[PDB]
PDB file of C-alpha atoms in Angstrom:
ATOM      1  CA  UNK A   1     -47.334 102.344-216.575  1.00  0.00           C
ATOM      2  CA  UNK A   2     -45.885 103.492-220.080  1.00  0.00           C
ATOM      3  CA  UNK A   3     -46.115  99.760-220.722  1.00  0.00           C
ATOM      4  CA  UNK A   4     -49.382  98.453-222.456  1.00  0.00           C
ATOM      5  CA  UNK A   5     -49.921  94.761-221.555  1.00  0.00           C
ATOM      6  CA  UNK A   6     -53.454  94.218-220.961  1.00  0.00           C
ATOM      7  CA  UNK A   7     -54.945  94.236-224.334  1.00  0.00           C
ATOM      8  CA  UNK A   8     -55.633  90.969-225.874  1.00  0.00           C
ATOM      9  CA  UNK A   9     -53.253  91.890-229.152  1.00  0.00           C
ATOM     10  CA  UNK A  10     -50.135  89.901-229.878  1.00  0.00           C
ATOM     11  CA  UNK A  11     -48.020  92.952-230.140  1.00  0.00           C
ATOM     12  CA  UNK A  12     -49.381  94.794-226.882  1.00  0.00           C
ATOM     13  CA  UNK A  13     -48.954  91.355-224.894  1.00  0.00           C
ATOM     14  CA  UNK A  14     -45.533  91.751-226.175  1.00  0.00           C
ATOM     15  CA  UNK A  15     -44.500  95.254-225.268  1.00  0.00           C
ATOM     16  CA  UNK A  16     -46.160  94.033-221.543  1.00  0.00           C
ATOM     17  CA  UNK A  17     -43.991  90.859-221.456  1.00  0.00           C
ATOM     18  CA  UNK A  18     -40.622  93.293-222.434  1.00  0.00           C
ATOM     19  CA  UNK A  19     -42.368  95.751-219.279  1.00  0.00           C
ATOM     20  CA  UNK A  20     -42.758  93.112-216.846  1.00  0.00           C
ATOM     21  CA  UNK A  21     -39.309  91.690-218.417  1.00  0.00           C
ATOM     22  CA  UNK A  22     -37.603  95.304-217.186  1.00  0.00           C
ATOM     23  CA  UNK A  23     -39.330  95.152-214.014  1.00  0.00           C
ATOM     24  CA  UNK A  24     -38.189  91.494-213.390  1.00  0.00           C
ATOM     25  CA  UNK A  25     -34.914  92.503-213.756  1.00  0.00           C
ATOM     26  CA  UNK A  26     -34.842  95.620-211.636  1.00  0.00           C
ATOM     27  CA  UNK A  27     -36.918  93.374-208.975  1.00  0.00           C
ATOM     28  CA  UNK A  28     -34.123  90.761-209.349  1.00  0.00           C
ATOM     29  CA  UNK A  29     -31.423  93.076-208.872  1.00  0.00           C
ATOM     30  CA  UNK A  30     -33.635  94.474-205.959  1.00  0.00           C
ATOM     31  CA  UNK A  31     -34.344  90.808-204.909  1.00  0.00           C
ATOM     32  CA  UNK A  32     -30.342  89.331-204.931  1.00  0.00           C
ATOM     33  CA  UNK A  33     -29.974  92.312-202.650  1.00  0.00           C
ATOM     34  CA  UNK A  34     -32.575  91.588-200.057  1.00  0.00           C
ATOM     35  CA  UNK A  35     -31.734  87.679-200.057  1.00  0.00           C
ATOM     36  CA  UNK A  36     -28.284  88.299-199.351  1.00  0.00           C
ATOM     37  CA  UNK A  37     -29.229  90.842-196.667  1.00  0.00           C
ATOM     38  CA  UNK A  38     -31.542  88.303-195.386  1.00  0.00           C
ATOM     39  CA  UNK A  39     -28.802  85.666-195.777  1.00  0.00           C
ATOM     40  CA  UNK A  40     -26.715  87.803-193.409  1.00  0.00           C
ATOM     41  CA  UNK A  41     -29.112  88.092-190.909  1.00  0.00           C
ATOM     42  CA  UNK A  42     -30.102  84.684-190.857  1.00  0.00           C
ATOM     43  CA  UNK A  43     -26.475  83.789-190.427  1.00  0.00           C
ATOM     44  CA  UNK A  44     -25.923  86.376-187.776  1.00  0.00           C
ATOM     45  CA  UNK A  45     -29.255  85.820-186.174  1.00  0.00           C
ATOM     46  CA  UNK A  46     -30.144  82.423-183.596  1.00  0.00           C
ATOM     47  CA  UNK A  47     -33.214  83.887-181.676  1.00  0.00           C
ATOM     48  CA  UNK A  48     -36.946  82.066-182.610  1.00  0.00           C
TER      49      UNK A  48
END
């Protein structure tokens, strides 16, 4: 939200990309912990 990615200058297009960067990598932290969750259930799970 702090982030301003929208406008068509080269420098706010680059503060969004470093945002959506940060996000990406709180999301990917977020999202290695969801796979292997899901990994673990898959694994423990049979049932269609």
């Amino acid at each position: 939200k702090e982030v301003d990615g929208l406008d068509v200058s080269k420098e706010g297009t680059e503060a969004w990309e470093a945002a959506m960067k940060r996000y990406d990598e709180r999301i990917d932290r977020v999202e290695t912990r969801i796979t292997a969750r899901l990994r673990d259930q898959l694994g423990t799970a049979k049932n269609a």
